[PDB]
Structure 1
Amino acid sequence: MQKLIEDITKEQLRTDLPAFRPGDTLRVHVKVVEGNRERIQIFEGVVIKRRGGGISETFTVRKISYGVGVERTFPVHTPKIAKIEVVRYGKVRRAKLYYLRELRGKAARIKEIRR
C-alpha cells in the first residue's frame, strides 16, 4: 500500500488497543447514544475475523444473546469503542472462524491458551 495513504491516516490510528487475534474473547466497550445521554454497552464475544489494513482494518465479534447469534463488525480504530479488553486467548487453527456460525453450545467451545 502507498506510504502516502499510510501517512494521511496515521493520526487516526488508535495506539491503546491490545493485541488480539481470531479466537480471542473480547469485551468491547461500545459508546452508545440512546436519547441525549451517552453510555457504554459491553459486547463480549469471540473474535471471528480480522481483515484489512491500516485505518480500514475491521474485526468481527460473535455472541449468542438470548438464543440468537449476533455478530458486530467494528473498524479497529473506531473512536466509538471506549476500550477492548481480552478476556481469554483462544487456540484456533485459522484466521477466519466462520465455521462457528453453524455451531452452538459445546461444539462451539474454543480451548484457552496460557498466553
Structure 2
Amino acid sequence: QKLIEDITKEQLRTDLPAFRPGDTLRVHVKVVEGNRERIQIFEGVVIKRRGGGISETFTVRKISYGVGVERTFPVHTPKIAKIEVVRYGKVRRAKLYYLRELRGKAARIKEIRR
C-alpha cells in the first residue's frame, strides 16, 4: 500500500493537531444552507479512530437536549475548518462505544481531564 499512499500524499490535510480517542474537541464545521457558509461550532466527546491514512475517521458525540448525537467525520476532509481541543482524558480504552448507553453523570465522571 505504498503506491496507494503516494497518490494521496497531496491531500493529506496537515492543519490539525493530533488527538486520542477519549477527549473533547471542538469542531468548526463549514455548512451550506443556501448560499453562504455558517461556521457552526460542534462539541462533544471523541470516540472512534478507525485508521487508514486518508481513510481515517473520528466520531464526536454530543448529548443535546437530553438526546445523544453520534456524528462521524473525515480525518482530512476540507469541510472541517478548525479543531479546538478543549479537554484531554485519561481513558483506559480506545473504543468508547459503551457510552451510547451511559447517561449522564457516569459519562461525565469518565471525562477525567488529564
Q: Does TM-score exceed 0.5, indicating one fold?
A: yes
Residue 82 of structure 2 is matched in structure 1 by 83
**Whole-angstrom distance in 2 between the partners of 1:114 and 1:105:** 17
1:114 Cα deviation after fit: 6.6
1:4 Cα deviation after fit: 0.5
* Mapped contact 2:89–2:113 kept (Cα < 8 A): no
Structure 1 spans left out of the alignment, 5+ residues: none
**Whole-angstrom distance in 1 between the partners of 2:109 and 2:45:** 9
1:114–1:74 Cα change, 3 Å: closer
Structure 2 spans left out of the alignment, 5+ residues: none
1:101–1:78 Cα change, 3 Å: same
* Mapped contact 2:90–2:113 kept (Cα < 8 A): no
Structure-2-length-normalised TM-score: 0.93
What's the C-alpha RMSD, in Å, of the aligned pairs? 1.5
1:13–1:98 Cα change, 3 Å: same
Structure-1-length-normalised TM-score: 0.92
Helix, strand or coil for the counterpart of 1:11?
coil
Percent sequence identity over aligned pairs: 100
1:110 Cα deviation after fit: 4.6
**Whole-angstrom distance in 2 between the partners of 1:32 and 1:26:** 18
Q: Once the two structures are superposed, what CA deviation does each residue of 1:49-76 show, in whole Å capped at 9, x if it has no partner?
A: 1112110000001010111100110011
Aligned residues between the structures: 114
**Whole-angstrom distance in 1 between the partners of 2:109 and 2:50:** 20
Where has structure 1 moved over 2 Å in runs of 4 or more? 110-115
Helix, strand or coil for the counterpart of 1:109?
helix
**Whole-angstrom distance in 1 between the partners of 2:13 and 2:74:** 11
1:112 Cα deviation after fit: 5.8
